[PDB]
Amino acid sequence: KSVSVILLAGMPKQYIPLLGQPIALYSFFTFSRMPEVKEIVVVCDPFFRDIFEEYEESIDVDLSFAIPGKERQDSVYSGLQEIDVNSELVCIHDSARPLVNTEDVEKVLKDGSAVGAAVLGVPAKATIKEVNSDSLVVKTLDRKTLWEMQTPQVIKPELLKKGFELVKSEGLAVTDDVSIVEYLKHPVYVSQGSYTNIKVTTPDDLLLAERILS
């Protein structure tokens, strides 16, 4: 249908098995089962293409591949160059987050469609404080006001392309995909997600993934 997924996956921690399946395939299959998703552009080294290639005939999406870049936004840009010319949303996901819920992907897809840009997030749990160059607390930031960003980050393609034109033209710096949209003064909605949508990096995260998958 209308959404193009850019799956970022470029032994690497995202191919470490979780219940004997590479971590990257969990989110991959989650997107493939959703009626809204037309295609998945996978961003990975050609070494690991086989891992996704095996299931092309089963899954109900058109599959594509793109070459990774030196940095995270370079990979997204490479991914972006492959999508259907009529895709209505780009859904950018980090494969190191295997536990993303179908329900939460649906939510951020809807919010992305309504607002133009949206990202899954959860309230920042820890007491965070603003600190200046002299290591002094500037103020305690309001606890309602702070949110941890996860993925997917969902952005209209025209918006993302226009955003990439600005970044390149003025050598601008980027954290995440929605930071690109922030430069445009176009709104970014934070869709409330789940604390379970963790990023798996350490062995303690890997064990955590299993305990949630139970």
Binding-site ranges for a second copy (CB under 8 A): 115, 119, 121, 124, 126-132, 135-141, 143, 145-149, 175-176, 178-179, 182, 187-192, 203-204, 207-208, 211
User: Could you say which residues in the range 26-55 bind K ion, by CB under 5 A?
Assistant: 37
CB 83 → a second copy: shortest distance, Å? 24
Q: How far is CA 2 from CA 10, 35, 110, in A?
A: 25, 9, 12
Name the residue nearer to a second copy (CB basis): 87 or 150.
150
The residues that bridge with 123 in the sheet, in sequence order, are 147
Tokens of 160: 């993302």
How far CA 160 is from CA of 90, 95, 116, in Å, comes to 8, 20, 9
Torsion of CA 21, 24, 26, 30, to 10 degrees: -150
Pick one of K ion, a second copy, none as the site partner of residue 37 (Cβ within 5 to 8 A by kind): K ion
Q: Are 12 and 201 in contact (CB under 8 A)?
A: no
For the bound state, the minimum distance from the C-beta of residue 144 to a second copy, rounded and expressed in Å, comes to 8
Pick one of 123, 128, 201, 210: the residue that binds K ion (CB under 5 A): 201
Residue 201 partner contact from a second copy, K ion, none using kind-dependent CB cut-offs of 5 to 8 Å: K ion
Spatial strand order of the sheet with 62-66 comes to: 62-66, 37-43, 3-8, 89-94
Residue number, 4 or 179, with CB nearest to a second copy: 179
Residues that bind K ion (CB under 5 A): 37, 60, 201
